[PDB]
Structures are given as C-alpha cells and as structure tokens.
Amino acid sequence: TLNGGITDMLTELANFEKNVSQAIHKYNAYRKAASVIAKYPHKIKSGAEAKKLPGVGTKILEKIDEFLATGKLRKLEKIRQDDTSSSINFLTRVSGIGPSAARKFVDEGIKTLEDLRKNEDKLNHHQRIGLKYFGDFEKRIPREEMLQMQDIVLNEVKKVDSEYIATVCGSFRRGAESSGDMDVLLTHPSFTSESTKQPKLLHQVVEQLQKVHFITDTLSKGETKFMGVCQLPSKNDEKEYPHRRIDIRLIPKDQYYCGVLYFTGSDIFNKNMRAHALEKGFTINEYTIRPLGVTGVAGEPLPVDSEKDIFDYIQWKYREPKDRSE
DNA sequence: CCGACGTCGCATCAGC
DNA sequence: GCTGATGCGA
DNA sequence: GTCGG
Ligand SMILES: Nc1ccn([C@H]2C[C@H](O)[C@@H](COP(=O)(O)OP(=O)(O)[C@H](F)P(=O)(O)O)O2)c(=O)n1
Numbered sequence: 399t400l401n402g403g404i405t406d407m408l409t410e411l412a413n414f415e416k417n418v419s420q421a422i423h424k425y426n427a428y429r430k431a432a433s434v435i436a437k438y439p440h441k442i443k444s445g446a447e448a449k450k451l452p453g454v455g456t457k458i459l460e461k462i463d464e465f466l467a468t469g470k471l472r473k474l475e476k477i478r479q480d481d482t483s484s485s486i487n488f489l490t491r492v493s494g495i496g497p498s499a500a501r502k503f504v505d506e507g508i509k510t511l512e513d514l515r516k517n518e519d520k521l522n523h524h525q526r527i528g529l530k531y532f533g534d535f536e537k538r539i540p541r542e543e544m545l546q547m548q549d550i551v552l553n554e555v556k557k558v559d560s561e562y563i564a565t566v567c568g569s570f571r572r573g574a575e576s577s578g579d580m581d582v583l584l585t586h587p588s589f590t591s592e593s594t595k596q597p598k599l600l601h602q603v604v605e606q607l608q609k610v611h612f613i614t615d616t617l618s619k620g621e622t623k624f625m626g627v628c629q630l631p632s633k634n635d636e637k638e639y640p641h642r643r644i645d646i647r648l649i650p651k652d653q654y655y656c657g658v659l660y661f662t663g664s665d666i667f668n669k670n671m672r673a674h675a676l677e678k679g680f681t682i683n684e685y686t687i688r689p690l691g692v693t694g695v696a697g698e699p700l701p702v703d704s705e706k707d708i709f710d711y712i713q714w715k716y717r718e719p720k721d722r723s724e
Numbered sequence: 725c726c727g728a729c730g731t732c733g734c735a736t737c738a739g740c
Numbered sequence: 741g742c743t744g745a746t747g748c749g750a
Numbered sequence: 751g752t753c754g755g
C-alpha cells in the first residue's frame with residue numbers, strides 16, 4: 399500500500415487505546431483515520447495533506463509529520479517499552495481476553511503464554527479455547543481454503559433441511575484473497591420477524607457440523623449466534639489444517655438484506671454507514687432501517703427489498719461488497 | 725466549546 | 741430465578 | 751481523536 403507505514407502506526411495506536419487505555423472512542427477514531435488514509439490513492443507527503451481527509455485531525459497530522467520525518471513515533475516507542483502495556487497488549491491477543499481481564503491477569507502475575515498455560519483453571523471457557531488455538535487463530539485463511547469450507551457448510555446445511563440458505567459473508571463476500579475467519583449468515587423460512595415456527599434452527603446446523611467433525615469447539619452459543627472453531631479435513635499423511643474461527647448468525651429470513659449488509663462489513667464500513675444514516679435521520683441495525691423522530695426515537699421499519707434500498711434511504715450511491723473493505 | 729461517536733448477541737456478575 | 745450492568749465479541 | 755452544531 400502507498401501509506402502502509404502511517405496506517406500501521408495509527409493501527410498500533412488504536413490497539414493501545416482499546417487494550418491499555420480502554421478508550422473505545424479513541425480506538426474507533428484511530429481506526430477511522432487509518433482506513434481513510436489506506437484508501438487515499440497518493441503517497442502522503444505531509445500531515446497537512448492528510449488532515450484534508452475526514453477523520454484525520456490536528457493530532458494525527460502532527461504524528462504523520464513526525465513519522466514522515468523520522469520513520470518512527472516517539473509516543474509508540476515509549477509504549478513498546480512499557481511492561482504493563484506490553485503485557486496487556488499480548489494477553490488481549492487471546493480470544494476471550496479483553497482489556498479488563500488482561501489487566502486483572504497482569505495484576506495477578508499472569509503475563510506470558512507460559513503463565514497462561516500454567517493457569518488454565520483461571521480461564522473461562524472462551525479464554526481456554528482461545529489459548530488452545532492461540533497460534534492457529536493468528537493465521538489467515540487462503541481463499542482456496544475458504545471455498546472448501548464453504549462447500550462443506552453449504553452441503554451439510556442442505557442435508558439438515560433443504561430450505562436453509564447459508565451465505566458466507568465477511569471479507570470472503572467482499573472478494574478478499576484471504577480471510578481472518580469464516581462468517582456464515584443463515585436463514586430458514588420458519589424464522590421470520592413475525593414468528594419462530596420451528597425450535598433449534600441454529601442448533602440443528604451446529605450439531606450436524608459437529609457430527610462431521612467440521613465444528614470442533616464452541617466459544618459461545620445462543621438461539622441466533624454461534625461463535626466457535628472449525629477445521630477442514632486433511633488427507634492421508636497430510637499435516638492438519640489450522641483450526642479456524644467460525645461465526646454463524648441466524649437472521650430472520652424477511653430481514654436478509656439488512657442482515658447481509660451487516661455481516662458483509664467491513665466493521666469500519668458499517669460504522670461509517672450507520673453514522674451517515676444517523677445524520678440522515680435513520681438508524682440501521684442487522685434487522686431493519688428505521689426513521690428517527692424529532693425526539694430521537696426510532697420509528698417503524700421501512701420496506702427493504704435489496705441491499706441497495708438501504709443505501710438509497712441514506713442517499714448513498716450503491717457500493718458492491720468488494721468496495722466495502724474499509 | 726462540547727455532546728456524540730453503530731448496533732447488538734452471549735457470557736458473567738451483582739443486587740433483589 | 742429475574743433484571744440490568746459490564747465484558748468481549750460480531 | 752475528530753467532527754459538527
Ligand atoms: N465491530 C464489528 C465487527 C464485525 N462487524 C460485522 C462486520 C464484519 O464484516 C462481520 C464479520 O466480522 P469479522 O471480524 O470476521 O470481519 P471481516 O470483515 O470478516 C475481516 F475482514 P476478516 O476476514 O479478518 O475476518 O461482522 C461489525 O459490524 N462490527
């Protein structure tokens with residue numbers, strides 16, 4: 399990328415503000431600025447040039463001037479030397495360990511991978527699985543493997559009930575050549591915004607995927623969201639594939655377009671689009687787009703018959719999934 | 725200046 | 741048990 | 751940290 403040094407610096411700062419400072423709005427601000435700089439089609443020559451972009455303000459412009467001049471950021475060089483910040487940033491790389499638990503572990507003297515493995519009984523279920531697969535979960539998934547995973551999920555879903563439709567979303571649907579995990583949107587005509595005519599709709603699919611040894615572990619599970627672990631089958635004498643994170647979201651079938659807009663992302667794209675919706679007097683979630691009254695109270699859901707209908711309400715030209723990788 | 729910043733599912737805990 | 745935060749996650 | 755009223 400043209401501005402990878404700057405965007406990496408802002409990402410590291412975002413991660414510091416999220417994991418150490420526990421400042422979620424600074425995290426979002428740094429990530430928004432990193433994203434707008436990442437798609438800027440010029441090699442940035444000054445902080446003033448970057449400050450013209452939405453989400454880049456005075457302070458990031460100053461950091462960009464320091465980084466352009468020296469190749470580094472003193473603020474980050476200090477953060478790296480802080481042992482508490484270093485430890486907290488490492489611990490939060492385990493799935494299920496967030497900013498609060500990381501700081502509590504550091505207080506308790508649990509600061510390393512060796513420390514975590516010594517103290518499994520101090521971990522909740524999610525954290526225990528996150529530790530088990532710590533290395534695997536930092537590996538990316540080649541699109542070729544995503545296609546094999548898609549084949550399994552779609553065919554196994556069809557064996558349970560031919561009326562299910564499973565849609566792989568996330569970076570995969572945005573056409574990425576690799577993905578961090580697999581995101582599966584699921585619908586069934588028995589589950590709509592008006593009624594649930596069949597119990598265990600998500601459970602039956604999870605169960606079938608466990609039965610064929612595709613799903614290997616569960617991080618959390620409810621009526622509409624599964625968060626877990628999966629693994630492709632390997633052939634004779636082959637090294638095993640890495641275990642992969644999988645998310646399955648069962649969405650009311652009549653609300654598929656809002657659901658697939660949400661689950662396609664990216665996360666920053668969704669934040670930007672929902673923020674624009676609010677400025678336009680609407681609120682968007684994974685189910686509906688609703689107007690806002692003068693009181694700021696959301697009104698009744700608006701008719702939606704395509705993803706583009708949602709863009710139209712907020713006066714955005716349509717963006718294909720491949721152009722949503724913010 | 726300063727209030728707002730996207731929205732919500734599941735796990736966990738506190739208070740009753 | 742229920743209800744309402746809070747944490748961590750999508 | 752940045753934006754917008
Ligand atoms: N904070 C978030 C996180 C996710 N999401 C939505 C949008 C994401 O695209 C979708 C899947 O979450 P994810 O973390 O797997 O993001 P992806 O877009 O798939 C990433 F590119 P990756 O390929 O690394 O998983 O959930 C969101 O709305 N808000």
Ligand SMILES: Nc1ccn([C@H]2C[C@H](O)[C@@H](COP(=O)(O)O)O2)c(=O)n1
Pocket residue numbers: 563564565583584585651654
């Ligand atoms: N998981 C899915 C995917 C699509 N669909 C529906 C939405 C549309 O009515 C129809 C067209 O699908 P597509 O948008 O993939 O062309 O399929 C669904 O009900 N559940």
Ligand SMILES: [Cl-]
Pocket residue numbers: 683685686
């Ligand atoms: Cl809704």
Ligand SMILES: [Mg+2]
Pocket residue numbers: 568569577578579580581
């Ligand atoms: Mg994903």
Ligand SMILES: [Mg+2]
Pocket residue numbers: 728729753
């Ligand atoms: Mg605003």
Ligand code: NA
Pocket residue numbers: 448449450451452453454455
């Ligand atoms: Na700007």
Ligand code: NA
Pocket residue numbers: 489490491492493494495496
């Ligand atoms: Na984590």
Ligand code: NA
Pocket residue numbers: 568579580581644645
């Ligand atoms: Na995911």
